[PDB]
Scaffold this active site. Sequence first.
Site, PDB file in Angstrom:
ATOM      1  N   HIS A  41      33.844  44.956  40.789  1.00  0.00           N
ATOM      2  CA  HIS A  41      33.482  43.536  40.831  1.00  0.00           C
ATOM      3  C   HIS A  41      34.374  42.672  39.916  1.00  0.00           C
ATOM      4  O   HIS A  41      34.018  41.486  39.752  1.00  0.00           O
ATOM      5  CB  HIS A  41      32.016  43.267  40.457  1.00  0.00           C
ATOM      6  N   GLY A 138      30.227  41.310  29.000  1.00  0.00           N
ATOM      7  CA  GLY A 138      31.568  41.838  28.868  1.00  0.00           C
ATOM      8  C   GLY A 138      31.632  43.318  28.569  1.00  0.00           C
ATOM      9  O   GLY A 138      32.725  43.845  28.335  1.00  0.00           O
ATOM     10  N   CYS A 140      30.816  45.742  30.679  1.00  0.00           N
ATOM     11  CA  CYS A 140      31.035  46.589  31.847  1.00  0.00           C
ATOM     12  C   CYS A 140      32.445  47.151  31.790  1.00  0.00           C
ATOM     13  O   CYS A 140      33.374  46.482  31.325  1.00  0.00           O
ATOM     14  CB  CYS A 140      30.837  45.851  33.175  1.00  0.00           C
TER      15      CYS A 140
END
Lengths: 301, 301
Positions: A41, A138, A140
Amino acid sequence: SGFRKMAFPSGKVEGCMVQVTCGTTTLNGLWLDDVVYCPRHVICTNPNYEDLLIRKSNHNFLVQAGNVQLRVIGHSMQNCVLKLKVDTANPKTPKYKFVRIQPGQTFSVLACYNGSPSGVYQCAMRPNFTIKGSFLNGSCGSVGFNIDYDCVSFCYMHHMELPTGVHAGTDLEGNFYGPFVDRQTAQAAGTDTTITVNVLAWLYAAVINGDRWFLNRFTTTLNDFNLVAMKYNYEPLTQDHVDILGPLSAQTGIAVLDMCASLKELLQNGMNGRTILGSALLEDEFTPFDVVRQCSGVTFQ
Amino acid sequence: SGFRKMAFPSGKVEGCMVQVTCGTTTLNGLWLDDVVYCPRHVICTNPNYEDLLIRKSNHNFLVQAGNVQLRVIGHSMQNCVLKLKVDTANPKTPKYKFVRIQPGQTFSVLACYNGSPSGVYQCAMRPNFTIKGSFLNGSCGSVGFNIDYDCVSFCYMHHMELPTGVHAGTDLEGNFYGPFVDRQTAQAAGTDTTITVNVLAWLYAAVINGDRWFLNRFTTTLNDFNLVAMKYNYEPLTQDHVDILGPLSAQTGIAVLDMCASLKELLQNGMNGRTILGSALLEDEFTPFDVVRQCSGVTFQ
Ligand SMILES: *CCC(=O)N(C[C@@H]1CCNC1=O)NC(=O)[C@H](CC1CCCCC1)NC(=O)[C@@H](NC(=O)OCc1ccccc1)[C@@H](C)OC(C)(C)C
Ligand SMILES: *CCC(=O)N(C[C@@H]1CCNC1=O)NC(=O)[C@H](CC1CCCCC1)NC(=O)[C@@H](NC(=O)OCc1ccccc1)[C@@H](C)OC(C)(C)C
C-alpha cells in the site's frame, strides 16, 4: 537467574532498514541483497493494486538508506508486499531466511520510523493471528524476526492496527497472518485464547528459577486437563505440546501432566495475591524454546 | 497504539562486545576505540587487586573480537573495572558517553556470553541499587545502555548476582551502584521500594492508550499522597517528580495530583481483577521519558 522478556540482538536487522517514499506515502522497507521489501500500500492512491502498480515507474519510488539515495531498477508485487529491485546490494545483509510461523510462536520486533529503528521488543503470534504490538503512525514495514546462530529468520512485516489496538501483518512473502486484508474496511480480530503450552513453559521457568509454591501433589489426564482448560479460554494441549515440554520436564523432574495439574489449580483458584516470576497473571508469550534459551545461555552470532 | 517493555536497538553495542580471557577466567569486555573495559575480577587468583594486577603481564590477557586476536599493549585498573589498551581501535565504535544513572532510571541490557550477545531487555535501577536482570554464568561484563539520537550512553556493567536472584554491578568507570563490593563475601540487597513517579508515568501511558477505568473525581495534596504512599512501600513523590510528569499531564488533561488520587485509590482498593496495559500489578519500570518516547515515536540513529 532472573527471567525477562528478552528480544534477540537487533543489530543484524537494523542494518537492513530503509525508508521507502513514493507519492505522499513514506514507510519502512527491508533491504536484503539488492531487493527492498515493503508493504504494497505504498503504491499511490478500496484499491486494486495490479491496476495501481502498472501505472507507476521506477523513478516514482524514493528509497533512502542512511544518507544515500538508492536507485530502483525494477519492481514486482508478491501478495501484499512490494519488492523493489535496487542497483546496490546491501553490504550489511546478514545470513537470512523467510519463515511463516505458527500461532504461539514468539519473535522480536524492531519498531522503525522513516527507516530508523526506534526500539525492540518481544511478541507472540496470538491464536487469532494478531500481535499485541506497540506501533504508531509510520511503523508499517517494520519487521519481526528470530535469530538462530548467525541467521535472521524474518517472520513478520507490520501493516495495520485493528480497532482493539492489536496489530495485523504479513510474512515477508506478503501473506497476511489471519483473515485480514490490506484495505481500510471493517474487519476485526477473532476471539483470542491463551497459549497453554507457553504458560506451562513459563511455569517450568519459574521452577528452574526457584519458585515452587504453585506445585501440587495432584496429577491429571490430558483429557481431563483440556476439559478445565477449555473452560478458561485456554487452547487445547496436544500430545505434541507435551513432547516439546519434555526436556523442561526432565530438567525439573516435574512430569508434564503434573505441571498441568498445577496449572489447573491455578486456573480454578487464582493465584491468591501471589506472583510467579514477578507477574500476577499467567504469562503466555514464552515458548518452551524461549525458556530453555534464557535458562541455559544460548547465544547467537 | 500498544505499550511494550521496549529496549533500544542493540546493534551499536553488539559491535563492541569482546571476549576477555586470562588464566581460567573468561568474561565479556567492551571495546571502544583502543580500550577494552571489563570487570577487574578477571585478574588471576578475599582479594587485593593492586597486588594481583602488578603480577600480571599484558600477554596474560587474551582478548578475542570475532575471529580476531586483539593484542593487549597496556592495562590499568579504575575502581572495579580493568582497562586493557589494545593495539587496534574498534572500527565499529559508536558515538558514546559514560553516565552514572540515578535509581529509577531505566536502561537496556545486552546479555552476552563469551563476547557473543544473547538477548536484549529493558531494566530499571531499583531504589536499593540492584537490577532485576536475567543473567547466567559468564554474563559479567555485559553492559546496560541508553541511546539518544546517535550516542550510546553506557550506564551499567554487570558483575554479580545476589542471593535473592537480583543483580549488582558498576558504572563503566567501575563504581558499584549501591553498597556492594566485588568479592564473594556475605552481602545482600537493602529493602526495595516502588518507583512512584514511574508508576504514575505508566498510568498516563494507560490513559494515552485509551484505558480510563482507574481515574476518579477525587484529588489529593502532595503531602497527603505521600502519607498513603509510604504505607505501601512507595518512594516519596517530590515536586521535582511532579514537574517531570508535567508534559504527560498536559497531553492527557489529568493534573498530576489528580493522577495521584487515582493511584492512591488503586493502592487502597487493589485493581479488583482488572488490568492496566495488560498488567495486573502496578508497573514501575517505565520512566516518564520512556512513556513519551513510546507514545510519540522518537527514533535513534
Ligand atoms: C502503513 C502505515 C502504518 O504505519 N500503519 C500502522 C498503524 C498506524 C497506527 N498504528 C499502526 O500500527 N498502518 C496504517 O495506518 C494503515 C494504513 C492502511 C492503508 C490502506 C491499506 C491498509 C493499511 N491503517 C490502519 O492500520 C488502520 N486500520 C484499519 O483501517 O483497520 C481496518 C478497519 C477499517 C475501518 C474501520 C475499522 C477497521 C488504523 C490506523 O485505523 C485505526 C482504526 C487503528 C485508527
Ligand atoms: C563474572 C562471572 C559472572 O557472570 N557473574 C554473574 C553471575 C553468575 C550467575 N548469575 C550472575 O549474574 N558473576 C559471578 O559469578 C560472581 C563472581 C565473583 C568473583 C569474585 C569477585 C566478585 C564476583 N559471583 C557471584 O555473582 C556470586 N554472588 C556472590 O558471591 O554474592 C555475595 C555473596 C557471597 C557469599 C554469600 C552470599 C552472598 C553468585 C554467582 O553466587 C550465588 C550466591 C548467586 C550463587
